[PDB]
Amino acid sequence: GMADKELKFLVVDDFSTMRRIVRNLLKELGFNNVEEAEDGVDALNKLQAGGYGFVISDWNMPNMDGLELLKTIRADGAMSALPVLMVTAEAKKENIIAAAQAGASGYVVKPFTAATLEEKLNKIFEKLGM
């Protein structure tokens, strides 16, 4: 819920309904510049076009999962610093630690509300100095 309301989000989830949920919560908070991807490879293909400012990624996706997507983002020169918020159905100490070591900006359990998403985005913005 930072003031840069045109920050371009990539919402990554293999469930169309989950992408629509995140897309609608972001809209409620004032973020309308949003694109969607269905797995890690889809997401990287769209990220290569440039201009993205925030990634919200499902942890469990086929072909390329959220952890491998995050690792590929952090290894990319031009995207190295992109915020990545990981989304999971269940919080597990080991998943959270592995995500943190791979550079995850944050971690949220679904289903979540607009207030909770707003809280996660702010905390990430504040942590990174945005």
Per rule CB under 5 A, is residue 38 in the interface with Mg ion? no
Residue 50 C-beta-side C-alpha neighbours within 13 Å:
2
Per rule CB under 5 A, is residue 65 in the interface with Mg ion? no
Residue among 33, 60, 72, 88 that touches Mg ion (CB under 5 A):
60
Measured over the CA atoms of residue 90, residue 95, residue 55 and residue 16, the dihedral's sign is negative
Per rule CB under 5 A, is residue 14 in the interface with Mg ion? yes
Per rule CB under 5 A, is residue 88 in the interface with Mg ion? no
Question: Helices (H) and strands (E) in the chain — how many of each?
Answer: 5, 5
In terms of CB distance, is 7 or 43 closer to Mg ion? 43
The residues of the shown chain that bind Mg ion, judged by CB under 5 A, are 14, 58, 60-61
